[PDB]
Amino acid sequence: THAYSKALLFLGSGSVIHSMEPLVGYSPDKSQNMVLMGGLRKYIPITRT
Amino acid sequence: VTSKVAASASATRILDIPFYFSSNEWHLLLEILAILSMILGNLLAITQTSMKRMLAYSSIGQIGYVIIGIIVGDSNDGYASMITYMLFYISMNLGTFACIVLFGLRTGTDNIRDYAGLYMKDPFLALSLALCLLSLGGLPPLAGFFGKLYLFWCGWQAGLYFLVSIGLLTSVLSIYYYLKIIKLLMTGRNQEITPYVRNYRRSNSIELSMTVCVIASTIPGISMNPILAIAQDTLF
Amino acid sequence: SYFPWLTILVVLPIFAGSLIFFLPHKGNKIVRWYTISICLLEFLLMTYAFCYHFQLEDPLIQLKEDYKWIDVFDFHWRLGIDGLSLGSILLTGFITTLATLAAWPITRNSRLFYFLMLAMYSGQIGLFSSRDLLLFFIMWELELIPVYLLLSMWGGKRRLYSATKFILYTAGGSIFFLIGVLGMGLYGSNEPGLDLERLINQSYPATLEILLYFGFLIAYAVKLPIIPLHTWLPDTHGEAHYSTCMLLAGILLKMGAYGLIRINMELLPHAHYLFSPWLVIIGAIQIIYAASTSLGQRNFKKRIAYSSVSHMGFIIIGIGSITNIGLNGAILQILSHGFIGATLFFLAGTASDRMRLVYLEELGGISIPMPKIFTMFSSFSMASLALPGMSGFVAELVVFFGLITSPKFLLMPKALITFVMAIGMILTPIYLLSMLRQMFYGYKLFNVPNANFVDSGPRELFILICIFLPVIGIGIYPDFVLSLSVDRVEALLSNYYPK
Amino acid sequence: KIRNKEINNGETGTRSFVKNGIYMADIGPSFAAHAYRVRSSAFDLLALEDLLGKEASNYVNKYLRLKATFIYYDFDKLITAADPDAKPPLLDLANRLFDSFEKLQAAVTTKDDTDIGSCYADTKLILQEVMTRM
Amino acid sequence: RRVCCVVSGGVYENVLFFPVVQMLKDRYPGVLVDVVASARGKQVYEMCKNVRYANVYDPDDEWPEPAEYTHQLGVMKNRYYDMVLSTKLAGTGHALFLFMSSAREKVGYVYPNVNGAGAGLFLTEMFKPATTNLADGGYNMYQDMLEWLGRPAKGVPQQPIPPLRVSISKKLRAVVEDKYNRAGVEKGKYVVIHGIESDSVANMKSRGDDDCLLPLELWAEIAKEISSGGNGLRPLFVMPHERHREEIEEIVGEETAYLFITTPGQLTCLINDSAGVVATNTAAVQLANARDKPCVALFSSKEKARLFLPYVEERKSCTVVASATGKLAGIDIEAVKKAVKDL
Amino acid sequence: EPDLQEDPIDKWRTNGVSPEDFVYGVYDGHHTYDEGQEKKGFWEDVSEWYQEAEPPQGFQALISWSFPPAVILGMAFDVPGEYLYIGAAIFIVVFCIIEMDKPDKPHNFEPEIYMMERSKRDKLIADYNSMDIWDFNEKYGELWDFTVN
């Protein structure tokens, strides 16, 4: 169970990073830092469900 | 060359014929000389800067060691080895003296620091000097190696141990200055060579002597079979 | 068969290189081809002699012959190949051909150089094919001058100090060897004595076995680096041209192991069986000491030198721990190290001479300008890490198996020594990747100008690939170097007497 | 440097193919830890003539020796640890096997093609029976 | 004949060694004279016309590992020097390092009483005390032992060869001097200021307490009236020989137009392209006084007779101002600017 | 020769000789978010890359290309080994005497002779490559004799 239940989350996180990466600079800790991110249900549904 | 040959020819006869009884009291004595002769004649040889004086130290101050190195250990099974080593030493010494005379006359200096670059200006003389020097060092394919070898192999075969080890050790030590001057031959740092080898119009008698004395420093070391077969018939 | 092969195989290189002299033709061009053709011819003759004129099924000597040379102290042209010799002979031919190729763009002298290369070639094969003890010694010391000249003419900044230390040290080490020669030569010289084959039945008295054993062991520890006798290696490796250093740290080191196998374990058993455990202990502590001092160095050439030092502990521990595989795994180890160390020194000398920076701290990101060097360097670093697949693994594995199943041990040091040996696997990557990370990773300045920075051309790349492929081929199916049935007679003598 | 404790497998001129110098770990004296390694070793010499039965049988005399020394020693360690009754027939079995092994080794040392297989047939027939009397 | 000098120290105590080298090349003509010094000192020998090639072995540490020791001896010995004249005040250990170099005439300095007075038997002409304070007196023993000591050679051969006469190669004179000059303001009509702060500027190895730096406030007060007036009207060259990228951000000699350069001991050309120089007791003093280059030296007090012997360099051009308080960071900076405003 | 000096000594184990990953003057702009798509196919790219060596030119190619498909087939329809090791033997000789009989280029010779006044051309090209043993221009005695026009 955990194999898939974690691989899905990793792939989703990668997708979220590359989706929001054009708004903030091309930089880790400027992206993939979910405190300046936050709230994406409206913008990318298919990778949110 | 000839002083050493004549002295070593007189010594064995003057010490073996009228001194049967005193063996155990001069066998030791000569040993005390040899153990010193092959040491004090090498250390100083390292620090030298003149060619003639360095040759005096090395080729005489020391090399008059392993000749004696069997006179003490002799039951008439060794004298052949002394004859062979003398025959090797005469040639391996006259070669380097001929080369030194030739270069000194052609340039006008003696000190070591002027032999730099000599390989590039005239390579034949540098090669025929390096050959004799290495032979003096006693390296396997040359003649001095087999000389020292057959001098030890008969002299270890006679019991005495604390003279062969010192001989080999001081030979290893003697390798140093030989390789030093050899290194000074092979070089190409144009801004280092003094204006002595720089003006050297390279080019009979001395050439003939040097070239027929240097191949006798490489061939007999491998062709010592008839020389050995000849040197065994000595009873005196 | 009676058509002499080994005589030809020994007198071909030096002879056919003596024609380089007295040949006024050019500056550099023609000599390179005239030397590589001779090298390839020699290697082809070697493999022809091995393939259809060898058996792999009998532990005697093959292709032997002899003559009369000096006849006073019985010393002949006695010469013969055997199981132990064959692997090292083939490896020498191979790696020296490839070294002579790697020495392609040398135009300083290019006439003395290739001749000296051929001389070292002939000397190595002469030693590895010897059958008469004095002739073994002659071949041993014959190479001492050519290597000194190659050091003092080409290579490194402080070439002189390294060269003189090396020559003095090796010449001094050979003194105890000559002592052993004089010792066991005079021991009943009527019985052949100087015929390395007919010495298997010698029964020497006590307190003399030990002295000859030590007289050979000191010289070997001089040649093959053992801990208290290793100080010469970093200087004579960090200063040598990579062309020289390839054959130097891939063949000349392994002579110290081949001789120790051939004249100690085969001739002086009760002088070696009462001295094996200390050999094992010394090798075990060497495996970790060499690495712990390698990690400290700061110029990667000396680091590679120390990495070569470290792997010489597996050979030691395999010589001790008297088994069939422990001795047999040592041979595979000398082969799989003559490959790896040689290639690593070639890569170190090829990366350098392009950057002219020796200290491992200023090496920027060289991965951006030259990818292929980075790839072929990481690959051989992995090989040196004892990584499986490559041949750097199976050798150490068989060494472990030989130590474990050894009969001359009862479980007390048979485990602690294995532990201290396995610490080497924790220790080696710490100093290999520490170099791989400083010198290659990271993004240095914008090294866009394609000047003094060009990836390896066809020659160097082919050399790297042609040395690499044997590593994989051996590490996948090692039994391409277990064609050794002499150990079934080599370890036959020792195996029952006391203790 | 290892001895035997039931001298009946040594035929006239007591010796065999055996290659001393092989490490055999301690398994404990029992007629269950020897009748098992003897099986799982006598299983190999069945699989011997599968690929290396023909095609330059110069390694066969380098592996038969090995995987038969195990049998030669473990079978003695076994035949010791058995009741008096079962010892005569087990010993008789031992005799026929460790003679067929010498025969097979001596025949394969000659580098033949059909003699090897004809001889191996007998040691297979007997050696398939060893995996049952256990 | 070959000669080797083993001068020790950094820059200011090595730039003063040029008279000895010139006296060597004058007494014995056509002599190859090499030199071994410290890394910071060897930098000075890139502007000279006598030495063959320099080297770097001795900051004169305590341990130095016994392979870099031998190899150094292994390169002094294997060129066969004749007189290895030395400095660094050999006792009884450093005397052996000279002795093993199998030359003919070993002459050097030794400790009076301290550090194992010694001086050994295996030496020649050991002399005066150690810490080597005075400048242009300096090696004062050497300019007497090499003077007519031997033979019909004329009476003392030109007692203390002309003072520092360093030359500049026209390649370095043009290209690097121009590139660094025109990086910022440049007309060849400016004024160099040297003593700023303390990393490795010259440090003089002998001044001790003063001349290391000024608090950069006196420098601002001086500079504000340097370009004031059409005399130069170029010069704002605080010339920081430091890590000044750690200092340029605090040039309270307001950073408006106060230029700055980084330099090795190559700044001799930059002096030669200036219109003067004003600095404390440092290498700039001797370098400027070597050429005409009217300088203004500001050291503590009365040390002139130690650090500045040619009081009248050319026309009493190089003038010196002392400090009545003795501490360098107090001076009649007003009279200083008065003196400076003329050039 | 100026060779400016050095500065506040750096970490012995400086993590990666690089700019510290603060001013790494783009993340993902130096290695990944970079590519487009331009041109150039496959085969006209391969047979425009095997010719930046002119590796052989003529016959010296035929004996080098048709050799591997004759020493891989050799391990089939088997032929005795003697035939196989004189085949490779006569190759290594024929290929050698064609290489050493090719012209010479300036980079081949000594360093001190590589740097002429661009009279190296008529000293080496058509001057060396037009004689056999003449040694009229034997200037390998370096003191800058230069013995040429």
- State the DSSP string of E41-59: HHGGGGS-SS-S---B--S
DSSP letter assigned to residue F108: G
- Is there a contact between E60 and E8 (Cβ–Cβ < 8 Å)? yes
**What is the phi-psi region of residue C71: left when phi exceeds 0, alpha when psi lies from -120 to 50, beta otherwise?**
left
Query: How many degrees, rounded to 5, is the angle at CA A39 between CA A33 and CA A43?
Result: 110
Interface touch E40/F3, C-beta < 8 Å: no
* Distances F121 to C107, C168, F128, F129, F140 between C-alpha atoms, Å: 19, 47, 10, 11, 17
Q: Say if F122 is an interface residue toward chain C (CB within 8 Å).
A: no
- F29 C-beta neighbours (distance < 10 Å), count: 13
Q: Do E234 and E259 meet the contact criterion of CB atoms below 8 Å apart?
A: no
Q: What Cα–Cα distance (Å) separates residue B6 from each residue in B13, B62, B74, B232, E239?
A: 11, 17, 19, 20, 80
Contact across the interface for E102 and B113, Cβ inside 8 Å = no
- Which pair of structure tokens corresponds to residue C487? 């150990």
Residue F110 near chain B (CB below 8 Å): no
Q: Under an 8 A CB cutoff, do D21 and C495 touch?
A: yes
Q: Which of C427, C143, C171, C388 is nearest to C293 (CA)?
A: C427
What helix, strand, coil percent values describe chain F, rounded to 5? Answer: 35, 0, 65
Which uninterrupted H or E stretch holds E84?
Answer: strand E83-85
Greatest alpha-carbon span in chain B: 65
Among E274, E267, E276, E271, which residue's Cα sits nearest to residue E295?
A: E276
**Residue C162 distance to chain E (closest CA, Å):** 9
C-alpha dist (Å) from residue E169 to B209, C360, E41, E49, F2: 53, 35, 19, 10, 11
| Residues whose CB is less than 8 angstroms from the CB of residue C358 and which lie 6 or more positions away in sequence, other chains included | C299, C300, C301, C352
Give me Rg for the CA atoms of chain B.
Answer: 19
Its sign, for the CA torsion A26, A32, A34, A37, is: positive
Q: What count of other Cβ atoms lies within 10 Å of the Cβ of residue C310?
A: 23
Chain C residue with the nearest C-alpha to that of D59: C57
F and B touch with 3+ CB pairs <8 Å, answer yes
Residues present in chain D in total: 134
For chain B, positions 184-203, list CB contacts with chain F under 8 A: 188, 190, 198
Helix axes B123-137, B143-153, angle to 10 degrees: 10
From CA E51, how far away is CA E46, in angstroms rounded? 10
Residue corresponding to tokens 């095997």 = F50
Task: Decide if E71 contacts C158 (C-beta within 8 A).
Answer: yes
Contact between C168 and B175 using a beta-carbon 8 Å cutoff:
yes
Do the Cβ atoms of B134 and C108 come within 8 Å? no
C168: which chain B residues are within 8 Å (Cβ-Cβ)? 172, 175-176
- Rounded to whole angstroms, the Cα distance separating C70 from B226 reads 9
Give the separation between CA E181 and CA C327, rounded to whole angstroms. Answer: 72
What determination technique applies here? Answer: cryo-EM
Distances (CA, A) of C338 to A2, C71, F18: 48, 37, 34
Token couple for E98? 């000279």
Q: Does C109 touch chain F (CB under 8 A)?
A: no
Structural contact between residues E27 and E158, judged by C-beta atoms closer than 8 angstroms:
no
Residue numbers in B near E30 (CB within 8 A): none
DSSP character for E78? G
Q: Outline where chain E has alpha helix (H).
A: 12-15, 18-27, 39-42, 68-76, 94-100, 142-145, 170-182, 217-223, 268-272, 283-290, 304-307, 333-340
Side-chain-side CA neighbours of E173 within 13 Å: the count stands at 8
**DSSP helix/strand/coil, C12:** helix
CB contact under 8 A, F100 and C33: yes
Which E positions 233-262 lie with beta carbon below 8 A of chain B?
Answer: none
Question: Across the beta sheet with E295-297, what order do the strands follow?
Answer: E192-193, E277-279, E295-297, E319-320
- Listed in sequence order, the residues at least 6 apart from C390 whose beta carbon sits closer than 8 Å to its beta carbon are C382, C383, C471, C472, C475
Amino acid making up residue B148:
K
Question: From CA C177, how far away is CA C187, in angstroms rounded?
Answer: 16
Nearest CA in chain E to C234: E67
In the three-class reduction of DSSP (H, G, I as helix; E, B as strand; rest coil), residue E237 is classed as strand
3-state secondary structure of E290: helix
Residue B86: phi and psi, rounded to 5, are -65, -45
The 8-class DSSP code of residue E259 comes to B
> What are the b/e assignments for C273-283, b being 16+ CB within 10 Å?
bebbbebbbbb
Q: Is the dihedral of CA E239, E240, E245, E247 positive or negative?
A: negative
Separation in Å, CA of B45 to nearest CA in chain E? 12
Task: Kindly give, in sequence order, each residue whose CB lies less than 8 Å from that of residue E321, ignoring residues fewer than 6 positions away.
Answer: E296, E297, E298, E331, E332, E335, E336, E339
Nearest CA in chain E to C235: E67
Q: In chain F, which residue's Cα lies nearest the Cα of A31?
A: F27
Which residues on B lie below 8 Å from E2 (Cβ)? Answer: 113
The reported resolution of this PDB entry, expressed in Å, is 4.5
Q: Quick one: which of C96, C95, C112, C114 has its CA closest to C104?
A: C114
